[PDB]
Amino acid sequence: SNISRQAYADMFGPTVGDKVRLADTELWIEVEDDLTTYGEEVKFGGGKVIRDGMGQGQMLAADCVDLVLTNALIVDHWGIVKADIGVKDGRIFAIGKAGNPDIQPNVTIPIGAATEVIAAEGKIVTAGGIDTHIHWICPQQAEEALVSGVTTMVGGGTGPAAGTHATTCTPGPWYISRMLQAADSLPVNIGLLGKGNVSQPDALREQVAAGVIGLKIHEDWGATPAAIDCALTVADEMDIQVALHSDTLNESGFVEDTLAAIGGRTIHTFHTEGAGGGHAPDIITACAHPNILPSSTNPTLPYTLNTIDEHLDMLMVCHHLDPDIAEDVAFAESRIRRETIAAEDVLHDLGAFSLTSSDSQAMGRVGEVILRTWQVAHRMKVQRGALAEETGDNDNFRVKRYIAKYTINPALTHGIAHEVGSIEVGKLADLVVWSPAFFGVKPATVIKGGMIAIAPMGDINASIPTPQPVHYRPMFGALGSARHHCRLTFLSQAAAANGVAERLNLRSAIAVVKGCRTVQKADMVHNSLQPNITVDAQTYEVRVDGELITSEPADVLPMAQRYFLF
Amino acid sequence: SNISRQAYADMFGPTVGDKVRLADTELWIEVEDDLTTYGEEVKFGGGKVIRDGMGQGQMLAADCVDLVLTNALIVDHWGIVKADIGVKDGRIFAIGKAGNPDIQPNVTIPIGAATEVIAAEGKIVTAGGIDTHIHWICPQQAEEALVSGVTTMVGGGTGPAAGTHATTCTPGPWYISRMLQAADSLPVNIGLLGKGNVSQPDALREQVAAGVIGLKIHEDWGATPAAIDCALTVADEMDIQVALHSDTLNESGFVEDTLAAIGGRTIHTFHTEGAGGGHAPDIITACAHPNILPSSTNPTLPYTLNTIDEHLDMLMVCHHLDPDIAEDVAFAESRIRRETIAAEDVLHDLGAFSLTSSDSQAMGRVGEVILRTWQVAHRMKVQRGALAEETGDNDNFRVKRYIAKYTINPALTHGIAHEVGSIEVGKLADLVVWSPAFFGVKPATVIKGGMIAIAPMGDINASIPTPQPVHYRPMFGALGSARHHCRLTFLSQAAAANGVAERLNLRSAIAVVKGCRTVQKADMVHNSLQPNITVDAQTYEVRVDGELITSEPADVLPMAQRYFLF
Amino acid sequence: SNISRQAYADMFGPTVGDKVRLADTELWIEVEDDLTTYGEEVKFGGGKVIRDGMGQGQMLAADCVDLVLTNALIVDHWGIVKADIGVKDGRIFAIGKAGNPDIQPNVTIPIGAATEVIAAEGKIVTAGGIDTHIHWICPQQAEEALVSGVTTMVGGGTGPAAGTHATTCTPGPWYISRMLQAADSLPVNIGLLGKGNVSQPDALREQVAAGVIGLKIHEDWGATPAAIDCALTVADEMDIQVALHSDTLNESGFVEDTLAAIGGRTIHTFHTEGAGGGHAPDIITACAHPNILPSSTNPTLPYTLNTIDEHLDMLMVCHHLDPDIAEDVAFAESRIRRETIAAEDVLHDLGAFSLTSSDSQAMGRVGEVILRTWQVAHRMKVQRGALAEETGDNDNFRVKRYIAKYTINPALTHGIAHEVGSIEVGKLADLVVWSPAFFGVKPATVIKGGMIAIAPMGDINASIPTPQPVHYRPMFGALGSARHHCRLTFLSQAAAANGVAERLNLRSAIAVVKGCRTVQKADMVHNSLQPNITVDAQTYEVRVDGELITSEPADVLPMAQRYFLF
Amino acid sequence: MELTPREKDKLLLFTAALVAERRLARGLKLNYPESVALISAFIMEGARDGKSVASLMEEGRHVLTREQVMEGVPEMIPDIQVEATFPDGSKLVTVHNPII
Amino acid sequence: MELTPREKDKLLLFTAALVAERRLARGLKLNYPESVALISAFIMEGARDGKSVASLMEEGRHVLTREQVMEGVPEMIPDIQVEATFPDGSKLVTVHNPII
Amino acid sequence: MIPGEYHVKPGQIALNTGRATCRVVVENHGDRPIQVGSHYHFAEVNPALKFDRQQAAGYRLNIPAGTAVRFEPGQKREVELVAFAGHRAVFGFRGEVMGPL
Ligand code: NI
Ligand code: NI
Ligand code: NI
Ligand code: NI
Ligand code: NI
Ligand code: NI
């Protein structure tokens, strides 16, 4: 028959042309496409469509999907579209029209007796986030990150030890083996980084052969041209990524010397703005190069009224610095600069910075990577208006550019994009369901490997799952063997070949990294700008093509006090 | 010598002729028999009886029990007796007189060096409850159920997904395999139900071969005569049980059509009263048939002042119904009827309804199956007086009739009575110890497979286990490998033969279901009445043999505000 | 150059000659030695020493340590010294000078790329405590004990059952096997005790062959001369330890009869003072013998104003005694004696009592063994002044004498000193890091097998690990497989040979006990006094060489209200 | 006390409500979690007092007004649900559009 | 409410502070854990009110004096740190030598 | 400002376009209510509903997906049907076709 658009949205979620506000921000998305056939939408419930002979077919398990997310509004780097999502064998099967081919038209995702149903009408579905700057200080970080919508965590550490408090390094074969075993207990995909600070290649090769998927070069262990060159040489032969935290003290040289040591080889620069570490005061100029994949850590995102005040002390504790030792404090005002902090936000909006990460418990907030990324997008819309790439009266392009920062780009940078990072067929089904009013803040459902791993859950003894108190609790996908089957432990190609998994008796699924040396700035989705950027040695002013790059500090931010109890 | 009866009770618990009040209800049990030899009771403690050469013997482990529960007051469908209980190899060894044959008379349960002791004098001991209507919405339900005294949970689900919120179905081979693996992490015996709504037999056979012990037919997936017939045909060939939630909408026919589709084949009817689902308004008439094993879900037990008010909204949320969609709300007053709700209580008292269950988080309370069953018995005694079967001035018969509802009858209905369901030799030692003042509300000890799995526990750092705060905490029987050894995962005969346990690498003990097609209404212990029941299409009045069946709503109930903090 | 001593201490911790106060007690330790080379100390952090080519070398993993604890102040039975500690393969590698041999002098502990760093400057490092009197009433005791600084727990039990509430016994092959499996889930080294009360040797041999590392003789199961002799005969042939709780009632004889039954064979006497159990009123005289290894349980340590008042009721609950039964209460004033309670403190100060333990939840506090031991040392310094063995103006000797009570002596007594008990090369790396202000009360870090297992941890989402709320949370060393690799399950030589580990499929590392029959009072470090002690049958007065031994009850104690929230 | 998991869970709701209660007292406009906790706790105490489900479904809509909460908060709470032990056992109270 | 793990963790800090608050009210000299909880909770409420980080770093040093706490307590707390949601998101407040 | 608000553009959606439809007068002859779903094979509904079953063969209700039409006892009403598509194979319901058509 006919139905009004409003009633249609209330029933099946918005359709082509309808706009939706992201949480309490000023960002609006608009449905670009709808893959359904009007009047043939699948809906679950008493007397609804998904029933035997109707929206459910007679096919065997091999011929239908295991899980279907109905009427989902997908927000990914490739589009903002309405569609059903099919999940089979823990992987994304199809993005199309679900139903029963026996009586319905254009069915691409068959529903049968073996099909579970998740109702996503009115919800936004995204890929799980990927944080590539984790300090394994405590195991509790995994739950915190999972609840925020991050499903993959890459970093290093052995626990609350000085080395880990300061750097993302899991030092040596023994600790690497131990952390690989401990990883099976965590509900997120994991990959470890070893200590790359050494001028003897074999010491690095052992670590890669032991299982790390990358090497962290950190100034606390000596970020010298010799160490840097050594790590990159081994990286080039083993196809692993290098993450850099350069020489802030300019002890071995300036940024141009570090860049020279790198010599055009692929490298991921951590907290490229510098507050989290790096040549003072111009490490930010690194984003101008083609071999550099730049990321930001979150405490500086976005620039607000309390940012500076807060940073001065946070620096000390992380890096084991002494507030009484003049030299330990003199490089505070050299590391914390309003000028670069303000510029960073703009550089993200332009696509010069391609990734966002946490820097968990070491000048970073593990549960705020997604949240802060959206706060930057909001503040940039507010201050700079629409991007040159926008089309139509929506913020669709700005949304694709920013979502790519914590999803596909991190995946590409660390050689795991063949497994995760986006909602594309064949990829692991790490999905996150959001109610529009809580987008980026509190997820409705977090799916890992095809099983719900965590979700808000009300009174266990209640007659329904909705009564208070509702708080995040672990689900079946986070339990024992089901967990192992739904998570991945990433290994280096060498470790995989050496039989590390069998020797350590790892229980989870194994994935191998590849393509870490071949990625470059141009490969970063919607974030490939290589600006002609300069930093004034005296004033610290950031300039691109001579024009001053800056922004104003926010007094109030969305996705803040309206959602949190504390 | 001689001892007064009162002092004797204070020391060894009540004996023949003594009566005990069940919690704060009006139900009184009377000790029917005592298997001890007066003056030869075993008691543990400093200077007590169970000591080398005295109440403890010189036999090897193979010749004595592992655990003895001394001076227990057993309440089971077969009797209310005083006796010692012997447990060996995780199973009930004997119900008799424990001690040392060397110096004591009539010892049937030998105590040796290898014997642990649990003092049950003054306590009531019962079999663990069995809930056959679980929606696996969250893993936390298992702890909640265990604390209440339920040791076996049968149902289906994959977590907090729409399909599971509404129905007890673990859809397909992949989800079944995943849930079978996750089950090893839970401290209760578990058996899964698959989605039985399909008209193609092979789609059902795959699920049974994958591991389910039953098939759930639910109207939300289409409870048509075709689907029903299909599920029963496969059930008949694979020896698994079918659980039904019929067509409330009368879309494919009325109750008589569904009954016709069933065609005299064995089937378990869920929430037979109808509020939880089923042909409006007469699904309750199903309890009149010999092939129907009827059960109630708990929110309607017993009929109280707030029952109706509460139900109207609970319905909506569970089944994904729209309060704005007239058709979604019109069938509220058709599903919630004071008339049938009131009759249900009486039908239970008469033995027409044979089981009680929860319907966990989908119009049911997981931790209130036992509690509510006793509340119904109380209210029925209060309103209807003694049952025709009572003998003596006690409620012994009414107690055996009601305890059977959540113990042996559920076990018989699902083909697991050879393993659990009652305190009989050879059965798994799933026992629950209760202090009389907290009977049915808060257990003193919950034993799984011969090991305590959960119990109230005080200050961990205290000098004794009794100081506050005392709350339920997991014990050794709920830990890792000890847990696997003390729980059972029930499989279908086909799954067991196919080597499903070895392929999924399941760690727990395996039990297989059998005898699901041969059980009938007449086999339900103390609950085999097949009444000539009718429901008036207009008035909804329930009549048995023409007489009106009804009851009055309770304003206050026992086992309520006197025991709970919230 | 030159640096003042004060500034030096603030940077690298105290050095030779500097004194440090233990928490808020009156005990002062003085650094006896410093193994560093002034100006060559290793320090970690930005711009610090441990960096490539500097304090970190070019060696492979096999040639450097996995973990280094820098600038630690070691407090062990052998000395109070300043040094770096090297840990390799989960064991203590060396106590010396860490660094890079390439540019630094006297390096004995090489630091390479494979080396993690824990900064211990300003902290006191000790071996993990060992509690040999655990009642396994609940699994939660392990976390409580670990947080206090105890890394090994020896005892028996099956959970909250009467037998375990009263005695440290894991009765028989089945329960022993079950507890051995459950032990893999706990983050502490564990060894079980079986029920030794039987007069048939084979019943004991089975238990030892099943896996216990000792046998508990308890009066609640009959501590008769026959049972005692039987247990010791088997102990002598299987090289396991016997723990005794003698006949308080003097039912089979007096203390001299029990001593006669023992016949000069090695035995560990539990709560030798008697309040926790033993011949009334003179079980304390046992500490005079060479074959007796005496220990105290903690509620009587030290003698304070509320000790007596508290004990009268605690006794009842533990041993299942009846306050109405005169005989059950008459032996209260016979068991609780101010005279022996006061003497115990002095006997510890003199070295007559060699061990301290808890008696967890059965007249003892699991998290207070270390805490109370230091409170006794404090009270003894206050009342008796310096020990005859002290040298210099410090309490160094008294500190070595008391630390040995909960570390090396328990290890020697139970045949596990080859694995744990002290900071010596080749021993398992179970270490505890303490800030001087919280010594003995709240640890800064608890290391098990070379991995941090528990530590105080602040806001998980914070930018650093220090923000509130800070409370103890499990770390990677307490997770799944990493845990198995970092803990030990002690087996008897027979169990190890019988393949018990493989049959039960135990996952943790296995250690075997040996040397239980050969240890004697003279082997107890700094606690080998065999005094000529007597107890007056009427007055209960304790006398050594005729002189009265006594002390005064404390009204206030350190390590109490200044540190605890409740 | 023998507190079951559900009783301990409700202690979390109670404590969350103590937080909101104090903030409202200071005169702040409550946020989302504060509003839900405040109204939920109110209902639990109502059941403890013995009020009926029907009464609470009504009374629960008069705890907080639109001017005592932050912008957008009323729309983020189309309803509030909580169960508690009434004299006649556990029952569910659903309050539709609690903030007006 | 959809409480995340970090929000539930802070409920522990809040409750710990309710304990100290009552004891101080009775006139007791607070101990170590009580002092930390009391001052920490104060700061969280400051952020809720909208006070700046800079203001709180100062105000936090005037919650408890040396005469309201037990001996040695001021020296056991060289600083106090806590994060809370300010109008501009999560921020860290560090109070140096809070007790003087 | 309303967090997550929609800005639905005004208008209407035409459902099941380009498909054969037919109207049928239906009467509930039973004594209990009958509610029929959008995708249910109309020709196989509850036998108490009287209508031309022959005309409703291979058809379903032409109403938005997931909604229903209720028929109280004795109720008579004209409904509009729309033909099944896909393979046009009916399986299930009352088992009257179990195949193509
Ligand atoms: Ni860094
Ligand atoms: Ni970092
Ligand atoms: Ni149902
Ligand atoms: Ni149900
Ligand atoms: Ni004892
Ligand atoms: Ni003991």
Side-chain angles (χ1 to χ4, degrees), chain C residues 237-308:
Chain C
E237 54 175 88
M238 302 181 97
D239 195 8
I240 51 89
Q241 194 51 270
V242 168
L244 178 74
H245 172 136
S246 63
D247 190 350
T248 301
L249 310 169
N250 294 313
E251 182 184 54
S252 56
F254 296 119
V255 70
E256 59 260 34
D257 291 290
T258 283
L259 288 167
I262 297 173
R265 291 171 290 187
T266 297
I267 199 163
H268 175 180
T269 49
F270 273 173
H271 44 59
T272 308
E273 176 274 323
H279 286 277
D282 54 7
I283 177 60
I284 192 163
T285 59
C287 72
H289 305 256
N291 57 311
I292 305 298
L293 313 157
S295 64
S296 287
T297 48
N298 73 18
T300 50
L301 304 172
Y303 177 36
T304 80
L305 282 192
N306 293 299
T307 305
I308 301 297

Side-chain angles (χ1 to χ4, degrees), chain B residues 10-11 43-48 50-52 54 56-62 66-67 88-90 111-119 445 449-452 455-466 473-477 479-482 484-486 507, chain C residues 136-141 144 158-167 169 171-175 178-179 181-182 185-186 195 197-200 202-203 206-207 219-222 224 227 249 251 314 317-321 325 328 361-368 507:
Chain B
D10 287 1
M11 240 174 248
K43 224 198 189 303
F44 176 77
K48 303 295 173 187
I50 310 172
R51 302 191 294 150
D52 181 55
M54 304 170 240
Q56 186 178 289
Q58 315 303 321
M59 65 290 286
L60 295 185
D66 296 315
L67 169 71
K88 182 169 168 182
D89 298 317
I111 299 179
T115 310
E116 171 63 295
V117 174
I118 277 179
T445 310
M451 276 192 94
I452 295 167
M457 184 53 59
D459 192 357
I460 310 309
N461 182 62
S463 53
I464 31 176
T466 56
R473 308 181 211 230
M475 299 292 128
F476 301 94
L479 287 189
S481 286
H484 298 149
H485 195 99
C486 293
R507 278 69 125 77
Chain C
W136 294 113
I137 289 175
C138 61
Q140 292 74 17
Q141 281 187 195
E144 204 72 51
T158 66
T164 295
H165 284 332
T167 80
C169 308
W174 196 85
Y175 270 118
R178 241 76 287 149
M179 292 299 285
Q181 300 182 306
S185 303
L186 307 176
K195 180 198 291 180
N197 298 82
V198 218
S199 296
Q200 156 66 58
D202 290 313
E206 294 183 306
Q207 293 186 85
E219 80 175 308
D220 290 4
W221 302 112
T224 58
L249 310 169
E251 182 184 54
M314 183 196 297
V317 177
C318 169
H319 300 299
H320 314 289
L321 306 169
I325 298 177
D328 282 9
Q361 295 184 120
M363 294 192 74
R365 300 179 170 104
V366 79
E368 304 187 2
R507 278 69 125 77

